[PDB]
Amino acid sequence: GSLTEDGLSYKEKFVVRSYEVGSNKTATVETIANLLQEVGCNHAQSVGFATTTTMRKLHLIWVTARMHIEIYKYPAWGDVVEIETWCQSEGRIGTRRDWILKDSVTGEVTGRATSKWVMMNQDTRRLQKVSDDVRDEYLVFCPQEPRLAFPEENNRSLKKIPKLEDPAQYSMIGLKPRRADLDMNQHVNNVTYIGWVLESIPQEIVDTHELQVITLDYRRECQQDDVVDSLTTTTSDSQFLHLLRLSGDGQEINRGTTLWRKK
Amino acid sequence: GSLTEDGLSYKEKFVVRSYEVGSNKTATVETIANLLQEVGCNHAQSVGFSATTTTMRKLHLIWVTARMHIEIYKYPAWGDVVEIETWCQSEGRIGTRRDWILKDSVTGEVTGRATSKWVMMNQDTRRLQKVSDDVRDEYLVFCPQEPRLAFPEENNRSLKKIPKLEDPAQYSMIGLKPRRADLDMNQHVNNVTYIGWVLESIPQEIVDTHELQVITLDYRRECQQDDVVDSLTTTTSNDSQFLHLLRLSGDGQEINRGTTLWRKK
Ligand SMILES: CCN(C)C(=O)c1cccc(N)c1
Ligand SMILES: CCN(C)C(=O)c1cccc(N)c1
Numbered sequence: 001g002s003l004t005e006d007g008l009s010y011k012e013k014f015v016v017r018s019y020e021v022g023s024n025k026t027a028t029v030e031t032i033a034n035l036l037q038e039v040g041c042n043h044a045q046s047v048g049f050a051t052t053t054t055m056r057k058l059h060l061i062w063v064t065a066r067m068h069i070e071i072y073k074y075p076a077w078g079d080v081v082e083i084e085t086w087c088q089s090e091g092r093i094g095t096r097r098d099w100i101l102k103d104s105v106t107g108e109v110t111g112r113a114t115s116k117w118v119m120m121n122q123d124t125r126r127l128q129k130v131s132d133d134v135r136d137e138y139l140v141f142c143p144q145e146p147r148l149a150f151p152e153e154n155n156r157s158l159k160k161i162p163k164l165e166d167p168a169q170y171s172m173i174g175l176k177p178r179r180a181d182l183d184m185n186q187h188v189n190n191v192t193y194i195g196w197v198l199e200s201i202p203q204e205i206v207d208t209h210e211l212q213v214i215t216l217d218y219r220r221e222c223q224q225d226d227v228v229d230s231l232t233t234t235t236s237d238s239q240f241l242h243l244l245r246l247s248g249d250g251q252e253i254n255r256g257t258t259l260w261r262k263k
Numbered sequence: 264g265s266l267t268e269d270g271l272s273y274k275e276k277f278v279v280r281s282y283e284v285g286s287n288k289t290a291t292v293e294t295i296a297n298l299l300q301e302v303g304c305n306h307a308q309s310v311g312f313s314a315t316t317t318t319m320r321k322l323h324l325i326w327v328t329a330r331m332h333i334e335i336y337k338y339p340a341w342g343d344v345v346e347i348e349t350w351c352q353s354e355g356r357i358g359t360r361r362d363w364i365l366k367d368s369v370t371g372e373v374t375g376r377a378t379s380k381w382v383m384m385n386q387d388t389r390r391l392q393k394v395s396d397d398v399r400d401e402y403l404v405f406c407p408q409e410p411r412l413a414f415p416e417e418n419n420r421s422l423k424k425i426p427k428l429e430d431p432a433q434y435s436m437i438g439l440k441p442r443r444a445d446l447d448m449n450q451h452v453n454n455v456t457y458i459g460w461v462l463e464s465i466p467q468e469i470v471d472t473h474e475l476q477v478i479t480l481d482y483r484r485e486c487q488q489d490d491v492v493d494s495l496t497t498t499t500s501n502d503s504q505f506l507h508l509l510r511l512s513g514d515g516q517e518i519n520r521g522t523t524l525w526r527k528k
Contacts, residue, residue: 018304019297019455021448030444034282041281045342077448174438179470180293180459184284184341191282195444206443 009086010043026074068157080104098149164243168231200232209260216256273306289338296455332421344368362413428508432495436463464496473525480521
């Protein structure tokens with residue numbers, strides 16, 4: 001993997017592995033989600049840096065508020081996929097990472113992604129606007145003119161997700177993370193939530209359709225002795241409305257929607 | 264990804280990824296477990312397999328994993344390249360063996376070694392059988408002929424009989440169940456998932472203050488749709504040893520038994 005000629009984006013090549021694919025022998029969206037995580041990490045390494053700089057000074061971290069993924073073709077087992085990624089200021093409101101996936105044999109786009117990150121405090125968890133000296137550390141590693149994997153004005157990735165109302169059409173109750181769901185700081189990694197959201201999609205739908213789009217808001221963390229319930233309801237191509245909530249008091253941790261095409 | 268000069272062994276290089284490491288920024292045994300699986304798969308393809316022979320596909324026969332044994336000296340750090348060599352051998356009519364060496368790509372030193380016992384089973388009836396000469400011949404031409412053992416030792420902890428755990432268990436993790444990321448391409452629970460289930464009953468205290476040196480795990484039954492697992496661990500003991508049992512939380516049917524051996528950091 002490497003920074004491009006201008007050092008304002010990063011590329012990496014991945015070979016899809018045997019345990020990385022589902023029953024179509026194409027990559028799961030979770031594998032895809034982990035390669036974006038991975039390529040985003042190596043791009044932080046390359047520049048100097050989760051990707052903190054003048055943040056751990058005041059005990060501050062970046063944290064995913066929203067993931068959005070559109071897949072045209074899921075790479076097959078043995079296929080090389082190329083992912084290019086870059087980061088942009090959304091002023092002091094925001095901070096965005098976009099990805100592009102290409103077939104490394106055709107150079108053709110098979111998938112694109114985008115995400116929103118905000119400041120916190122690993123301790124108090126309180127949201128924080130981005131200061132001047134925080135935009136003087138990373139904005140030298142970012143494109144200055146807007147560059148959007150989702151350019152389209154009023155599209156699928158900027159719009160409000162409603163809260164699923166009881167009763168839910170479908171549910172998988174009592175989901176618990178294991179140690180393999182934890183990152184190196186012992187937090188459930190953003191990708192397990194994607195897994196829990198998809199767990200309440202019926203097998204009939206997975207077996208006959210293909211996931212075209214996922215959109216996931218990150219509202220609260222699950223703390224490895226919390227148990228999640230996962231709720232889905234057909235809102236409709238099939239579309240679903242998603243809610244993850246703590247098994248007990250019913251506290252929201254994620255809401256999302258998904259969009260499937262008939263195979 | 265290539266067969267060696269003599270095409271009786273296969274080598275692959277893996278770079279350790281961010282989401283593949285634990286609290287020490289070194290790869291988890293499960294990540295190791297997955298790279299051993301990935302490299303075994305690429306070696307089957309390399310000699311033209313899928314790892315069923317011509318006869319096996321005809322007779323609805325598959326290779327199943329009876330025992331996994333893994334000994335790690337050093338877990339490769341996030342960003343480190345790791346080289347794994349793997350090879351198979353006839354264990355006569357009983358079944359096959361697959362053996363792995365893990366090396367550091369920079370120093371060339373062994374950092375781990377694994378070994379496994381594969382038995383032949385009917386897909387459908389789920390019924391073990393011995394290796395017909397018709398089959399032995401089809402894969403023997405892809406195996407070393409002189410024994411080549413990752414675990415040569417005259418009394419190695421890879422071939423020793425594992426007791427069943429007596430109730431009450433010292434530790435337990437109750438109600439474990441697979442999600443879709445736990446399934447392989449043919450919709451069966453991935454063999455690595457049981458490693459993680461086994462290790463869920465090891466208390467955090469041990470994990471935070473020791474390293475896993477040795478895991479030995481026998482496979483007795485699989486998780487066959489809607490099943491829920493309980494995980495049982497009891498200390499059998501510098502070195503902490505454990506005895507392990509997985510069972511279906513209903514009838515209490517055994518699926519796995521195992522041991523682990525941890526050293527203080
Ligand atoms: C799994 C990580 N999550 C959900 C968070 O820590 C979090 C909490 C509040 C707001 C946001 N954006 C994120
Ligand atoms: C998923 C792998 N497992 C547990 C099996 O299919 C199995 C069943 C019986 C004996 C053995 N050795 C393995």
